[PDB]
Amino acid sequence: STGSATTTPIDSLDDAYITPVQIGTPAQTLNLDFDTGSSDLWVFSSETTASEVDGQTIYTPSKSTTAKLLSGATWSISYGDGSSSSGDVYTDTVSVGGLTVTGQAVESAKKVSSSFTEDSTIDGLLGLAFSTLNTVSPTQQKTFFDNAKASLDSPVFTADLGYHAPGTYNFGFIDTTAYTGSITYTAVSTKQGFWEWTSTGYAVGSGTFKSTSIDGIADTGTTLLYLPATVVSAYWAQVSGAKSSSSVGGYVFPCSATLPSFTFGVGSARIVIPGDYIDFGPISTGSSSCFGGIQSSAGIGINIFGDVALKAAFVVFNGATTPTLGFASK
């Protein structure tokens, strides 16, 4: 089997992308944020505290003939910014892009934090990291991908995120028309449950490539590119007027500035992030200070190749017995 679904930016900055997911029978379609940095499939639901729902589409298990309570199972998760959600668990049929899994654990939120309530466009998250990160207790549950794998033509999924445009998540095959050149594959460490890999270095603009190992995670659920302070400082040094603002929470730059590209290495291959992809717009409406798309990971503990980087590539998440990541230009 295979599946293919379009993912759409939730706003004009590509802050996140949403993909329609069918849950239950008859289908209830929710728009979920596919997140390669977590391993829970959770949704706003008929059980979510009413005051915590503002515009989201909800899953109502009582209206699904295939839903069944997973008795005794609970879940609770926090993300990199401290946002969080928790609840109980149903099993139900879940389809993405034509690919169906029966008995998928669908984690129904009872509680969601303020930042979730405030985003009316995201109905929940679909986690694509390794199932070792799944928060369901007492019996950990598998991801949609881990459940689908044995049915898939090839045990892969691909992310082709667009710049200010829709993209595509494919399951079970590699669309050879979606990229240019070759796909360079690199090793993955699953020791922390993430799609963790090591870039071979970087360049700023037309500058010399600096060969240096940068360990980080491929996280579709993160907007920006988070890299060591050394690397980040070297980037922003090439932008007139750019500075790290403590009050704003990162590097900002004058809206009048033209940004250089940023290149990262994948083996002997190179992925170029255009400068335009690094502009996240005014810090507040009407400001002439803009927020940068490359930021330091120094506060975080890990480097994160989020959407700014990933959208410059065709990315293959190879879930074979020994996982690997592939990157191509597009």
Binding site: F34, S38, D40, T222
Partner: peptide
């Protein structure tokens, strides 16, 4: 907002 999907 920016997003930061689990530590």
């Amino acid at each position: 907002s920016l997003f930061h999907x689990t530590p």
